[PDB]
Structures are given as structure tokens and as C-alpha cells.
Amino acid sequence: SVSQALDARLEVGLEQQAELMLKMMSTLEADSILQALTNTSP
Amino acid sequence: SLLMGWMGITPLALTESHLATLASSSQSPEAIKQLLDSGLPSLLVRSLASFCFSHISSSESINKMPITADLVAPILRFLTEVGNSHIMKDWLGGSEVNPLWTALLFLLCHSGSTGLTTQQRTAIENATVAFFLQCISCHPNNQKLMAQVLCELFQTSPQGNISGFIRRLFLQLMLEDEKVTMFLQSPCPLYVIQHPMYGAGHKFRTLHLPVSTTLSDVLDRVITVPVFHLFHKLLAGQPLPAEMTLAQLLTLLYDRKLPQGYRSIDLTVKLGSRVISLLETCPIQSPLQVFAGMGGLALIAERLIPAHSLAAFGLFLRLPGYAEVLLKERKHAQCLLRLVLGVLPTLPFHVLRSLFSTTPLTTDDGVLLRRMALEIGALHLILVCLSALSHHSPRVPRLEEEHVTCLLQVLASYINPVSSQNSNALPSVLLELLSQSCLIPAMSSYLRNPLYRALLELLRAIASCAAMVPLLLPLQTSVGTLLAKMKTCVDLVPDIQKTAEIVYAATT
Amino acid sequence: WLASGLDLSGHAGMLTLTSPKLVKGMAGGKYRSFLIHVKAVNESENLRGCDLLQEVSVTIRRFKKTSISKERVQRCAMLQFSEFHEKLVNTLCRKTDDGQITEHAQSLVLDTLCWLAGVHSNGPGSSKEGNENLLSKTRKFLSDIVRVCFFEAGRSIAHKCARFLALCISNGKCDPCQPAFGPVLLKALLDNMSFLPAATTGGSVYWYFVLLNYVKDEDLAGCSTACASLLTAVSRQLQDTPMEALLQTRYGLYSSPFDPVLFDLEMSGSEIDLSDVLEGSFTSLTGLLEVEPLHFTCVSTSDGTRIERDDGLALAISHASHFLQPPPHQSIIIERMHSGARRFVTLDFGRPILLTDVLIPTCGDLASLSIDIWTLGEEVDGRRLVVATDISTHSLILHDLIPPPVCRFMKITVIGRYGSTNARAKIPLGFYYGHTYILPWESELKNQPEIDQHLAMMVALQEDIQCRYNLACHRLETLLQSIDLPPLNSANNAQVEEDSRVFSAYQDCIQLQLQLNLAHNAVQRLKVALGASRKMLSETSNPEDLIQTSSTEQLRTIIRYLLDTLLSLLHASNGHSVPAVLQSTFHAQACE
Amino acid sequence: TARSMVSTIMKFLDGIHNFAPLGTITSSSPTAQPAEVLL
């Protein structure tokens, strides 16, 4: 995965949960790709 | 002759493979004679010149056959491949071909960004570089032709920025050593597809090597003791020296009826026995020195490790006669130019010192050079450099030691050229300029403490010129009595005593 | 619910609560107090719901007071009258005849679109007629806005549009007569795979593919066949010289040193050996061609801490090129380590600068790190960028700060891990990325030269580095002609000063090619800042023509990206039956 | 017996070298200490 690190100066903005959801999209992408790389063909 | 009749030669359309085969099959003298007798080279160069003129006219407005933007780089590569023949190099050196040079240069310099894409632009740039490398190779007539052409383009440079082609051509063509083809025939084994003149196997060798190397280096890469000896087909009964460079051999061959433009020189290797005039010839002139002969360095300087020495080198090379004494050491001059494009800091002042010494005040060249140095402001630059290096200011109305020594040597050679109508040989403008600068306080600071020898040379130089004497008076101990005091303190010795006596005589 | 604000780890979270009805009721100027209710709904310490919370924190942020009075009705106008929103959509479509819309205006309308989507993310029982109208106007022109944002825009505009579209994804509490944003955004994204190799920015297509990979879970067949068709097309296009092939066989050098144009640079702090499979997070930092790195100068250093390095127009051009350089790798060494080793360092850029992306490699002996920025004083304008407490697990990656901050001084505070042994280690400074020229609109957020001289000097630097790249290519070709070409097939190729000089020439060619590419992106950025635009995707463009006329590096990056999407699509079946469409277009000859 | 292309293209897929650390040791009689320190 990636580090649990988000912009602290952007907390004054309204899109903090937007950046959070973008980052978990990225982490689920990385996890799914690693799982597809590790898994074989049944 | 039958192959000529196939591709429509007794409009026209030849692909890249067609011209590849034609350039490959034209290297023999009879084939290149048939190619020159045929009108295909003339019609192709007329076609490409018309294409260049059309593209220039279209960009500035915002037997013939139409050449497109794609075929022109392969047919320029055809020119590069056919130019191995010496009569090809003589034909490219005529006035019939020169429109090719002028058209390509005006197209790829003036006509900047019918549309020229970047990949095709790089293709034409590399093809023109290959053509220029092939043309002046071992051909002094083509060398002076390209030198005149580039001098005339730099003369008509618009008034300030230089395009990329001309800059990279300066940094490429005359900034690499000339490369010639070495052919080696020997019965003993010597240890890619080439022309069938070059033989086969390991007993026939062909190299593409720079001229500046000697025969010992190319023979190293390839009691009675067998020793390799080199022979030429035009020399009967004498070997070749091992430390003899290829420029001397090329000049000897050109003085020995070898035709000009012969791209591959041939040598036979034999085995002789050893028991345990040729080197004194002039070398090749090379395209760089030929270009610098008419002062092209000043033309390109007008259009252009401590950094101040490298900045002052560009100002120093603008004087006439600077490049002629600069080209004595080729490798270090090339290294200095490589540092300019982006021992080494000593050379831009050492060459100026040698040029001062080789240009006396009894001739017009020395006084013209001195007045041009007065006009362009080299003395101001060297004086503020000495002020910054010596941490001293002008009288307002380990590397640093070497810098100070070299600057003092430059000043000493500037005052008296013979030391390294003499009263009116130098104007009083230099006298009033040196009376303002930091020469006297820096001299008083350094004196009261090779370099001492250079300072004594500066003292006898400034005492040799009668118009430069009254600078020695301090603005109350005279310099002669002071110098006598520290000479007695020091007491090489005869030089110190003679210079101190000369300074004392000048002060009295 | 709490699920709309949970963190990536799931052990923490944060909600930003606001509403248009809040300011609508505050327009009367009467409300002053609020209540908040925490309630557990249902369909050792057995904590249920409200007792499950460990630590709580409350903050309230006020609105910015501008110089325009009676601002209440001005803010209520957009919430009451919806004809603004469609007009904003029109400013995305470039259909208005009032001139040509620049990138700055697009950034501003996308910012206010993101703000209105954020305030409409939580509408309590209110009339969603304006929300439905803006959503309908978004769905009507979704292909046009995704084309002008993800294909004809930089990293900032594409990132903001991805933020707005995924925010529209997040608040999808649609009525049963309204479809969800998923299907329609999916169809809008698959309506623009044809124009993908004619894009402009690597980060734009990166955000495009992130959104595609997320929303592809609704419909699987169309994305699969579009990806497979583009696989076949760009694969049959990419096969069309022996030069880079000879490089690949002889030295394993895959990036072409003769193609002068690239697409993006991807790097991360996390040839490939085939034995383990017998790097997934490396797409975290994309689009590093539009943004150049900076240089580091350490100013302040704490006790027991040392920063070390790990082991006349031509002069001005050379100095500007030296300012535009990747600095060598540096690091921090600590004399004495302990449980909670608090150390402090300060970095200086030398001038005010825009900071966009930051990368800190993984340090397994460090508990936490925190970075502060300031321009004039530490207590004057210091704002916190990011504090990360899991450096030992993964690397710190923060990508494309929107809005991009300006700064001159960086403060790095590091706390070591608990129970740390007294063995020395290295904390690399990482790689910092920013914008050398500060634009006037980004200067006003928090002796500046004019645009024209900066553009002229950047064009001169691009020309000089183009000359350097061309001479490097000529040297590389003339040297590479001298490689032995045996008739021994390729077995002896897989079987030295010449190798070292070829590697050095290739490294120089790659470095100058990268410099030329980012300089060209910088002058393109300055040209669109002047008022121009990049390449316009015309409606009459043949997809095969723009496939053929695309750069090879762009084709390689787009191939890796969409077959990455194909891998994720194949794994998304959860081991069930693979769809027949991508199993049918990939027949024997297609696979071969 | 010369090394052909197979040895070149399998050599990196995995000058006299030691092999004692790779192997294990044992003895037919129960000793007071194991002999792996010798390896």
C-alpha cells in the first residue's frame, strides 16, 4: 500500500475527504494489481 | 552502362534503395567516371537547390525533377557515400556544386520554424554534417572552400542570435580532429562490410583514425629482432618513422603526386631485422587553422577553474593574429574551446604573452594590436583582474599566485615585446590609464614583503620604454633605493643585481 | 454515517459538515448555537457504536470575509438560482462565442464547481432541484468536459476535474427517477478512449485511468472491448529501427535516446528479476515532466544531526541550465538514536518558489516525520503540509498539491521509532518538485520579472539543450556504429571500456533528453499562460491517424496504463467466469 | 567440454568456490557440541 499521509494545509478546504477517497482508490488499485500479479490461473 | 539504362538514364523517380545501390556501385574510378559523365548528379543537385529555394521562399512569404522533404536526406547520404572518390571531391569543390552548400545553409539557417517536421529536420542536419565531414576530409581545396563559405555566412550574420545548426557545426566540424582512412596490407595476420578494395580477412586492415596520432600508436593497436616497418607504394627502399604523425605523411604524399581527396591512404607492413628529413616536414593545415587564417574567430566572437579567465579568452581571441599563435598547441586549445562551449586558466594569458613577444614594436602589427587592445578594453579587464586577485584598489583621484605571475608576465610583454622611435611607439593614453589603476599600490604591497624574476622583467621593461618611465615616481623613497635595500636583504643573483642596477640607473 | 469519512487505515476518520441550508438560514442573521448528536443505529469491553469511539476532536472553520458587501444574497444566488451551474458547464464546453477560454479561467470554474459539489454533498431534506439540474447538465456534456479536462489540460486541471467527478460519485444519493453518476461517467470515459494517444499530460491520463478503474465495476464489457481494441491498435503501431533494438540486446537500454519527446516521468521511493514472479505503487508520482525539481541548501540543524551527500549569453544559459538540474542524493545521519529521537532540520530553496510534489523514501528506523513550510517567519505564515507516522511501513508520497503553495523554507521534524537500537542509519531528503516561475495568480494566493523575458530565456535554454541533445545523439550514433556486429546471431550478444563509454553516452543522452522534454513542457506552460492553447482535438480527427502520429514514449506509457487497467479488470471478476468479449477478441492470432 | 551458450544463459538465472556454508554437518556418534561451527 501507501503511507497514511494527507495534506494538513488542505484541511481548511472542503475536499479533504475527496483527497482521502482518491488516495484509497489508489491503494485499492495497488492492492488489486499486486493480488493479480501474485494469483495464478485456476 | 547497362545499369544506367534501367533507371531511366541514357521524369525520374529513385527510392532510397536505388540511390543506395548507385552510391555503393560507383566507388570504382570507371564507375564514378560514368556517373560524372551522366547527368544524374547535376540534375539531382539542381533539383535539391530548387527545393531549398522553394522552401525558403515559402517560409519567408508567410532536366529538373521535384524533390520532396523525405527523399532529400537519403540523397544527401548518397552524396556522402559517393564523395569517397577523389574526383568526386574535386567535382564538389567546383563552382557548379557551391549552390548546394549555399542553398542548404540558407535553408537550414534562415528558414526557421510546406512544413519541416523535427525528425526530418534532424535528418537533414545529420546528413549535412556527414556531407561536410566527407567534403573537407584530406582536401585542402575543400577545406579553404568551407572556410570561405562559413566566413562569408558569419560576415552576413543578422544584427545577433546564432541558430542551432551553425553553433553545433562550429562545435562539431572544426572542433574534432581530422579523421583519415588507414589501409594496411601485410602477409602476416593483423590483430563490418567495406569496399572490395580493402580486402578481406585479418591480413587486410582498414581503420578510421584521427590524423593527430602517429604510426607507433596504430601499430601498437594492430641480437637480431624482427621489427615492423611501414612502406608506401610511391616510396621505394625507405621505411617510415614510428613517431611520425599522419599529417606529415599526408603532406609528403600530396607533395609526391598523390591526387587530392584520396580518402584512404595505403601502407604495407614488412618484417625487418634490428640489432640491439621525414620528421621535419610541415603538417597538414587542417580546417580549423585554415578557417582561422582569415580571422574567423573574431567574426564568431562578435556574434557570441576561474570563470573570468574563460570570459577574457573570448575577448582576447578577437584580435588579429591571436589564433595563429593559439594553434601551436592543438590539444590544449581544443580543451579550452570545449570549456568555453560548456594550465587551463594560464593559457589564455600565456598565448597573449607569446603574441606580444612575437609582435615587436618595430612593425605595424604590434602597434595595431596594441591600439586595438586599447580600444576594446583588454587592459581594463586585466587591471581589474589583478585588483581582484591582489585584494588592492586603484588610486582614486596557490592558484592566485600563478594568476598574478601570469598577469605580470602579460604586462611585461605588453610594455617591452623584445624583453620576452621607441618613445612614440606607444601613446600617452596608456600612460594616463596606468597612472589611475592599481599597479603602484599592488607593487608597493608585494615588494615590501620566477614571480620575482617576472617582476624584475616588468621593471626592466617599464624602464626600457622612455615614455613609460615617469610612472616610477611615487606619489618619499624611490623605487631604486628600495629595490637596492631588499636586494641587499635577499643577498638568480646576477639577474637580481642587474635588474636592480637598471632600476637605479633609470631612477637617477 | 461514519463510513463516508473513514481513513485509509480505517482506525480514524474526519468529516467536514456544511450545507447550503446552513447559509440559507444564516442569511437571516439569527442563529448562534448548534448541537451535534452521536447515535448508534442497529438493524472484554463489548463497546457498541458510540462507545466504540476512542478519541474525539472538534474544530470549526469560518468563511473568508471579502471586500464585497451583502455577500449573503450573493452566496444564496447560486444555491437558489441554478442557471449559474449550466453556464459554468458552458464554460467547460467552449461553446460560448465570447472569445477563447484560457486555462486559468478553466481552473477557476473548476474550483468553484468543486466547492459547490462539496457544499451539495450533504443536503439535509432540502429541495435538490438545483442539484439535480447541475447533475443533469454534467451528464449531458460529460464527454466534452472529460475531453477538455483529461486530454487538453495539465496535471492541475485534470486533478481538479477528477476531484469534482469523484465528489459527484461520492454524494450519489439520487432519487429513483435519477440514474447514478457511475454508469454515465463510465460511458463518458469509454467515449474518449479513441482520443487517448493524442493527449498532452501523463498526469491527466493517470487521473483518467484512476477514475476509469474505479467506476469500471458497474459495466465490464464495454471498457474491456475498448481496452482490447486499443491494445491491438497501439501494439500494431508501436512495432514500427534496429538502433534501439541493438541497444536493448547489447545493454538492456529500453528508453529511446533518439526520440526527443517523452510523456511523463514516474518515480517512487519503494530490468526486473523474473524469479520471484516465476512496484505497484510506483504510479504514485506521475507527470513529473511539467514540473522541474529544485535545489537544497541546509540552514538550521539540530543537535546530533548532520546533513551529508550520498555517494555572455552562453554563461547565463549554462547557469539557467544548472538551476534546472536534478540534485544528487543526500541524506541525514544521526549520532545518537533512542526511543523518540527528536531531530530538526531546515532547508532553503534560495528564493520564493511553488511546491507541488514531495517524496520521502522509506526509513524503517523512524517513527514519524512532519514537514512545515514558511516564507518569511516561522510564526508569521507557517502552515503544516503533512505529518506521517508510518514511515517504516511505506514511503511518504504527496502528489500535485492543489492549490499549489508558495514557500522558501522547509522544516523537517523527525521522531525515531520506539525501542530503536543504537545503530546508525540514513534519512534521505528525497526529491522536491516545484515551479521555477511563479505565475501572478498563484503569486496572489499567499521584483518579479515579466512573462516575456522569462519565456525568451526559457526558449533559448530549450534551443541550447536541443543542440546539446543533438550533439549527444550524433556522438552516440558515431560511437555505436563501432560496436562489433558478429554474424554469430544473438547467442554471443548475450555472452570493458567500450561498454562503459556506451553506458556513459547513453546516460548523458537520457539526461539531456529529459531536460529538453521538461524545458519544452515549461515553455508550453508559459505559452498557455500567455493566452494560447495546446493541441485541439478536432472532431474530424481519425483515431488511427492520431494513433500513428503519436510519440513512442506516450504509446509505451499508455500501453502500460491500459493493460494495467486490463489486469485490474481481470482480477475484478473475483475468480468467477471471465467475460466472453475480451476472451473472444483475444484469439490465437491476436494473442500471437 | 567448453562452455557453450547454455552455460552462459543459465549461469545468471540462479576461480574455485567454497561449498561448506551451503551444506549441513552430522556425525555418527552423539557429540557434546554440533560441528556446524566448522562450516
Coordinates of N, CA, C and O in Angstrom, one line a residue, chain C residues 7 27 58 78-79 101 108 124 145 150 161 170 187 204 259 299 303 305 371-372 406 413 417 431 538 565 574 589 591:
Chain C
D7 N -10.8 6.8 7.3 CA -9.4 7.0 6.7 C -9.0 5.7 5.9 O -9.8 4.8 5.8
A27 N -28.6 33.5 6.5 CA -28.9 34.7 5.8 C -29.8 35.6 6.6 O -29.8 36.9 6.5
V58 N -12.9 18.4 17.8 CA -13.8 19.3 17.1 C -13.0 20.5 16.8 O -12.2 21.1 17.6
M78 N -26.4 31.3 -6.1 CA -26.1 30.1 -6.7 C -26.9 28.9 -6.1 O -27.2 28.0 -6.9
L79 N -27.2 29.0 -4.9 CA -28.0 27.9 -4.3 C -29.4 28.0 -4.6 O -30.1 26.9 -4.6
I101 N -11.5 30.5 -24.2 CA -11.4 30.4 -22.7 C -10.0 29.8 -22.4 O -9.6 28.8 -22.9
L108 N -10.4 28.3 -12.5 CA -11.3 29.0 -11.6 C -12.7 28.4 -11.6 O -13.3 28.2 -10.5
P124 N -29.5 18.4 3.7 CA -30.5 17.8 4.6 C -31.9 18.1 4.3 O -32.4 19.2 4.6
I145 N -16.6 17.6 -21.2 CA -15.8 18.1 -20.1 C -14.6 17.2 -19.8 O -13.5 17.6 -19.4
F150 N -9.2 16.0 -19.3 CA -8.3 14.9 -19.1 C -7.4 14.7 -20.4 O -6.6 13.8 -20.4
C161 N -10.5 18.2 -11.9 CA -11.7 17.6 -12.5 C -12.0 16.2 -12.0 O -13.1 15.8 -11.8
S170 N -19.2 10.5 -4.9 CA -19.4 10.2 -3.5 C -20.7 10.6 -3.0 O -21.3 9.9 -2.1
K187 N -19.7 5.6 -19.3 CA -19.9 5.8 -20.7 C -19.2 7.0 -21.3 O -18.7 6.9 -22.4
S204 N -2.6 13.7 -16.5 CA -4.0 13.8 -16.9 C -4.6 12.4 -17.2 O -5.6 12.0 -16.7
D259 N 14.4 9.5 -29.8 CA 13.1 10.2 -29.8 C 13.1 11.3 -28.8 O 13.3 11.1 -27.6
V299 N 20.1 25.1 6.3 CA 20.3 26.3 7.1 C 20.5 25.9 8.6 O 21.5 26.2 9.2
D303 N 20.8 19.2 17.3 CA 22.0 18.5 17.9 C 22.0 17.1 17.6 O 20.9 16.4 17.6
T305 N 22.9 15.7 14.6 CA 22.3 15.6 13.3 C 23.3 16.2 12.3 O 23.9 17.3 12.6
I371 N 6.5 17.9 8.1 CA 7.1 19.0 7.2 C 6.2 20.2 7.4 O 5.0 20.2 7.3
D372 N 6.9 21.4 7.7 CA 6.3 22.7 7.8 C 6.9 23.6 6.7 O 8.1 23.4 6.3
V406 N 3.2 28.5 -2.2 CA 4.5 29.2 -2.4 C 5.2 29.2 -1.0 O 4.6 29.2 0.0
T413 N 10.8 17.8 10.9 CA 10.9 17.3 12.3 C 10.7 15.8 12.2 O 9.7 15.3 11.7
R417 N 11.8 5.6 16.1 CA 10.9 4.6 16.5 C 11.2 4.2 17.9 O 12.3 4.4 18.5
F431 N 13.1 13.8 -2.9 CA 13.1 14.7 -4.1 C 12.0 15.6 -4.0 O 10.8 15.3 -3.7
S538 N -9.6 17.9 -32.7 CA -10.7 18.2 -33.7 C -11.7 17.1 -33.8 O -11.3 15.9 -33.6
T565 N -5.0 -1.5 -16.4 CA -6.5 -1.5 -16.3 C -7.0 -2.9 -16.7 O -8.0 -3.3 -16.0
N574 N -13.1 -11.7 -9.5 CA -13.1 -12.4 -8.2 C -13.0 -13.9 -8.4 O -13.6 -14.7 -7.7
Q589 N -4.4 -15.6 -33.2 CA -3.5 -14.7 -34.0 C -3.4 -13.4 -33.3 O -2.4 -12.7 -33.4
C591 N -3.5 -12.9 -30.0 CA -2.5 -13.2 -28.9 C -1.1 -13.3 -29.4 O -0.2 -12.7 -28.8

